[PDB]
Amino acid sequence: MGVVEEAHNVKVIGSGEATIVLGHGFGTDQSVWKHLVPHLVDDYRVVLYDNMGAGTTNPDYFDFDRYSNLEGYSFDLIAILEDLKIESCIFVGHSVSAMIGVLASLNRPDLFSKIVMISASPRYVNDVDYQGGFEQEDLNQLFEAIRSNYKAWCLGFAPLAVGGDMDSIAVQEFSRTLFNMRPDIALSVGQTIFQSDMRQILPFVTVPCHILQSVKDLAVPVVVSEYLHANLGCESVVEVIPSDGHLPQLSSPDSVIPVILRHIRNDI
């Protein structure tokens, strides 16, 4: 199918102009969309892909310099869109993919008609005038746990990230995909994402954004949604969902999928 499409496990379901591209967050893969895709395929051409470094990708292709900032991932996204000859899409970005889509839209705004963000944050680290949810010391302890015993870290982190019942199928799934990453890649990518800062480029975004999140999200205080809405230079709307978890489209589909669908199907 071509090296880029093989390397990112690209799947295309359907045909036609109206196209939706779905990008996943850290520690999971395109399977995170399993409860959303069934409701899209009758009305849209649906494109799924995996971020390089996901456990479903070949670690030999993980270039630590290319992926030392989010720009490397945004170049991959543009490459996939171009390889598929997509002239315009709705982009649904989960977690880090929301910012990867934003960055891609700075370089090629023509390729995106809308960005729908789920569990997005432009900055996780707190400062005296900004609540991101984490103090640097707690990120440091997280990285040390990853380095010291990756499996043990995965088992303890997955229930916290997913929320809900610690024995749920979604917790089991995310524990598996987390541990599917190569431990050195997980550590490097975790540092790159948790230390990122996208706040300063938000005024330059022009593609309209829909900002969705669980009301209880381990890595995204609700004030972050309001920050994105206040500082994005594009038209935007916020909807906080009465759900728990950072992967709510996987773990609470009954309450979460209808919200995502409304924001995909309706413009601001």
How many other C-beta atoms are found inside a 10 Å radius of the C-beta of residue 265? Answer: 12
How many other C-beta atoms are found inside a 10 Å radius of the C-beta of residue 41? Answer: 12
In the DSSP assignment, the letter for residue 82 is H
Tell me the C-alpha distance between 19 and 58, whole Å: 27
The yes-or-no answer on residue 217 being catalytic is yes
Q: Which of 29, 50, 76, 217 is catalytic?
A: 217
The yes-or-no answer on residue 94 being catalytic is no
Q: C-alpha distances in angstroms, 83 versus 10, 34, 78, 135?
A: 11, 24, 8, 40
Q: Which of 29, 76, 95, 97 is catalytic?
A: 95
Vertex 247: Cα angle to 35 and 15 (nearest 5): 40
Tell me the C-alpha distance between 93 and 78, whole Å: 14
How many other C-beta atoms are found inside a 10 Å radius of the C-beta of residue 19? Answer: 21
Which residues make beta-bridge pairs with 254?
Answer: none
Q: Which of 24, 210, 246, 263 is catalytic?
A: 246
**Any idea which residues carry the catalytic annotation?**
95, 217, 246
